[model samples]
Target chain A: KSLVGVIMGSTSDWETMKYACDILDELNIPYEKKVVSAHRTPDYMFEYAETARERGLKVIIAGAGGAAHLPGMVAAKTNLPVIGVPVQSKALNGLDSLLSIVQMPGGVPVATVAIGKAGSTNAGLLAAQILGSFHDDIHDALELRREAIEKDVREG
Target chain B: KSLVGVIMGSTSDWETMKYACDILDELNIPYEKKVVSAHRTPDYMFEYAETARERGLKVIIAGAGGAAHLPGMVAAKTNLPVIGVPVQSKALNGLDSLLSIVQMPGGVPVATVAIGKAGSTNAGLLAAQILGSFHDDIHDALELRREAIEKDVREG
Candidate 1:
C-alpha cells in the first residue's frame, strides 16, 4: 500500500533516482521501486500497469532515458497518475528523453518534469502534493518538506 | 526591408535551410534569408526583432542547430509571429535544439515545428497561413495547400 511507486527502465537509472527516494524518505512518504524495461519486458510492463491500480497504489512515478516511452506506455494502460522524469541520456544527454516524456499527443498526459536529478526531485514533490490535496496530515508534512527544500536553496 | 526574414545561427546551416528556400519559392512566398548567431551577435538578433514588425516583415522564420534559441528570441522581440526550424546536429543531433525551441516560457510563445526538413517545410506552410489569415488570396492558397498535403494521407 505504498503511496509512491518509483519505477525505471534500468538499474543504471537508480544512480539518478536515488535522490528522489531520499526526498520520499524525508517527506515520510512510503514507496516501492523496481526496474521494468519497456523495450526488454513489454509484457511485464503491461502487467505492471494492469495491476498498478489494484495494488493499492494511488500514484505512480516513472523515470527513463532516451526516446523515453516508458511513462507514456504506463499512462496508456492505467488510470493511476504518473509523474515522469527524463533520466540523463548518453548521446543527446537527456534532451531526447525530455521531449519524449513531455510531449504526449493530446489526450494521454504524463505530468512531466525536467531532465535528470531536478526532475526526479520534483516528481517526488509533485506526488506528495497530489496526495496532500486529499489528506490534511500529508499536506502539512509536504509544506514542511517544501519549506525545508526552499530553506536549503536559500542557504546554499 | 525583407518581407519574410529567414536566419540561422551558422553559415553551416545553409545546407539544411536550402530546402526551406526551395519550398518557399514553390509557394511563391517572398522572403529574405541570412545568418544571425543568437549568442555571437545578440545585438543584431535584437535589432532585427525590434525592427521586423514595423519594417514590412509579416513573419520571421529562424533556424538553429544546437541550443536553438534563435526563434524563441525572435518571438520575444517581435509583434509578428516567429517559426523555428531545428537543424539536425551530429553529437547531440538536433535534440538539444528541439528542447530549447519547444520549452519556451509561458508569456513568450514560439510556434515550433519538427526537427530538420519536415520542420522547415511546415514552417514555410505556416508562414503562408499567417499571411493568408489577413489576405483572401493567400488564405485560399493555403487552404488548397493543406488539402494537397492531406491528399497523400488520404491516398495512402
Candidate 2:
C-alpha cells in the first residue's frame, strides 16, 4: 500500500518537487508521484483527490507554481491530510505559489511550508512526522534524521 | 486621472489589505478600492485589468487569500503594473496566499510584497515608488518615507 502521494502540477515542477520525494526516499517512506494540474487538468485533479483515501494514501504533498490550486483543491475533495509546497516561479519567485497553497480559508486546512526547495524538503519531513504519530518505526526514523541535521548544523 | 486602483478578492480582506490604502492615503496618492474576486467573478477581474490602462490607472494593488490568483491574472490581462499583497490566512498563515500571488510565469509579473499588514503597506509604498519614476513629487514622498523609517530603526 502506498503510504504517501507526491503530486505536482507539471513535470517541470520536478526541479523543486523532487526535494519532497528525496526526503521521502531518505526516510524509507513508500510513495508515488505524478504531474497533476488544477488548471490544465481539473477533472483529473478532482478524481485524484476523491480517491486518495481509498488508495491507502496517508498524506498528500501537492506542489505547483503561479496560481497553484492543486493543494487546496485536493484538500477540498479529500479528508486525508494534505501538505503544500510552493514551487518557485521565475518572475515573482515562489510568492504566488506560496500564497495560493498556504491560505485555505477556515475549515479546509492545507499545512503549508516555506517557498521552493526548503518547502519541498520539509513537506516530505512533515509527512513523515505526521505518519510517525502512530507508527513507532517511522518516529525513530524521524528522530535519526533530525539528529543528523542537528549534527550537520553544529559542525557547519 | 486615477493614479492607482486598490482591489481585493473579498470584503473580509479589508481588515488586512487596508494597510495599502492607508499608505496611499498618507502619501496623498489618488486611488480607489473594490472587491473583485477572481474565482467568484472572473469576468469582473478581467474587465478591471483590461480597462485599467484606458481608465488612466498607472498601477494596481490587489490583496487576496486562499487560491490568490487575482494579481497574477490581472497582470496577464493588462500592461499596467500590478502589486500583490498576500493577506495572512487563518489556517496556513497566508503562506498559500503569498505563493499564489507571487509566482508568476515568465512574462506576467506581479511584484509581490510580504504577508498581511506589512505587505499591504509595502504595496502602497511600492505603487508610489513606481509612480515616482515619472513624477518627482511622488518620488520625494517615497524618499521621505524611507528616511523616516530609517530614522525610526536607528532611534530604536
Candidate 3:
C-alpha cells in the first residue's frame, strides 16, 4: 500500500494536481491517486478518510476547487496529516479551494499549500517532509532536492 | 435596512474582513455585520441566506477561512450577488478560503477578490461597483474614487 493518498475533486483538477504527482514521482514516494468529491459523493469521501489510517497511509494530499471542502472535512474524520492543494478554478482562481482546506477550526488542522501548480508541487514535497520526520532515507532525499534547488537559484 | 450584508464565519476573521467593511464605510454603503458559520451553525447560515433577499440585501460579502463554505452556500439559497473574501489563515494563509468560496461550480457564481486585506478591500469596492451598475450615484462615487486612486499611484 502507498504511504500517501493523493485525491482530487475531479479529473479536471489533474492538470494542476499533476505537479504533485510529478514531485512524488521524482522523489520515488509511494502514493495512490483518485478523484473524490465532498458534495457529490459524501459517502465515498467519508469512507476514504475514515479508512486511510487503517490502510497504512501516513499522509493525504487532496486538491479541489470551488467550495473545496474535501481536505478539511477529511481532516475532520481522519487522524493522519492532510495536505491541501487549492486547484485553480475558472472563475475565482482557486481562492475558494485554498480557504476551504486551510482554515480548519481550533481542533483540526490541515497543512495547506499555495494555490494551483505551486501548491500541488509543494504538497508532494511536504508529504515527503512529513515522512522524513520518521524515515532517514526520505529525509536525505528532501535535503538533496533542496540543495539542488538552492544551487539553481544561486546560479540563475 | 442595509443594502449589503457582510458576514464572516467567525469573529477571528474580522481582522481580514474588516477591510471590506472599511471600504463600505468610506463609500457610505449601508451594510450589516455578523458572525455566521456553515459548519457550526448550518441552520442559521441557511436561514440568513434564505432571508437575505427579503431583508433588503442587494449584495452579500461573505468572508470565512478554512472550509469556507458560507459564501457559496449562501449564493445557493439567495438570488442576491455574493462576493467572497478569503481571510488569511495562520497555516495555509487563506488559500483554502479563497478556493472554497470562488469555486461555485456551474449555475451559482461568487465574485472572489484577492486574499486577506487586498481581497476584503476590493470586495467592498466590488460590491459598490455591482450596485453602481444599477444606480448612478454609486457609479459616480466609484469613478471619483478610481480617479483619486489613479492620481495617487501616478504621484507615488
Candidate 4:
C-alpha cells in the first residue's frame, strides 16, 4: 500500500511536481499519483481527503497552478499533512497559486513550499520528514542528504 | 512626526507602491520614500534599516518584484513593522516575490499583502493603522477608509 499520495491539478503540473515522485522513489518511499484540481474537480478532492486514511495514505502531496487552493482545502478536509507545490503558469506566473496555497485562513494551514521546480524537491523532502516520524530508514536517509551538502562545502 | 516610510527595491515597483503613497497622502499622514534593493545593494539596506527609527521613521513599507527580499530583510534589520508588497514582475509572475516576502522565518515577521497595486494599498493602510496606535487624527481617517471598504461590499 502506498503511504504517499501525489495529486496534480493537471498533467502539466506533473512536470513541476515530478520531483516529488523522483525524490520519493529515491528515498524508497512509496507514493501514489493522480490528477486532481481544486476548481475542476472539487468533489473528487473532497472525497480523496475524506477517504485517504482508509486507502492507507499517510500524507498527500498536492500541486496546482493559478489560485492554488488544493493543498489548503485538502488539509481543511483531512487530517493529513498536505505539501503544496505552486506550479508555474502563464498568468501572474504561479504567484497567484503560491499566495492561494500559503495564505490560508486561520482555521486551515498548508505547509507551502517554494514556487515551481524548486518546490517539487522540497515537497518530497518535507514528506519524508513527515513520514520519518514513524520510519527510521527515512530519517537516516534525510540526515545523509543534509550531511552530503556539508561535505561539499569548502572550509578554506 | 511622519512615521510611515514606504520604500521599494526598484523604480519599476513605483507602479504599485504608489497606491500606498496615495492612501497615506489621503489620510494626511507624514511618510518618507526611497529605493532600497536587498539583493542588488545589500549594504545600503542594512544601513537604512539599522538607523530607520533614529531617522524618525516608525513603520517601514517595502515592495519588490522577483526574489523580493527587501521587505523580509528590512523586518530583520529593524524592530518596526515591515509591510511587504509583492510588486508584479515580468517572469515567474509576482508569486516568487510574494512567497519570498510572506514565508519569513519565525521571530522575524513581515506582514505581507497580495500581488500588484491593490496589495500596496493594503500595506499602506496597515502601516497607518500601526501608526494610529498613538496618532488620534490619523486613526480616525483610517477608520473612515475601512468603513468605506465595508460599504462598497455587495451582497451579490
lDDT, model 2, position A137: 96
lDDT of 4 by residue, A15-129 (tens): 8888889999999998899998888899999999899988999999999888788898899999888888888778677778888899988888788987877788889989999
**Model 2: per-residue lDDT, tens digit, B93-155?**
877777677665566678999999999888998999999999999899888888998999999
Q: What's the distance in Å from true for residue A23, model 1? A: 1.1
Top candidate, metric DockQ: 3
CAPRI grade, predicted model 4: incorrect
Give per-residue lDDT, candidate 4, residue A70.
86
- In candidate 3, stretches whose alpha carbon ends up further than 4 angstroms from where it belongs are A1-66, A70-103, A107-156
- Cα lDDT for residue B26, candidate 2: 93
lDDT of 1 at B21: 73
Please identify model 2 stretches exceeding 4 Å from their true place: A1-66, A69-156, B152-156
List TM-score per model, in order: 0.51, 0.56, 0.58, 0.53
Best by TM-score: 3
Steric clash pairs (candidate 4): A95-B95
Model 3: residue A64 alpha-carbon error in angstroms: 7.5
What's the candidate order when arranged by decreasing DockQ? 3, 2, 4, 1
lDDT of 1 by residue, A58-122 (tens): 67789999989998798666645566778889999987887787655422446555577866776
Please tell me how candidate 3 rates in CAPRI terms: acceptable
Report how far off residue B127 is in candidate 3 (Å): 0.6
Taken over the whole model, the C-alpha lDDT of each candidate is 0.72, 0.84, 0.83, 0.85
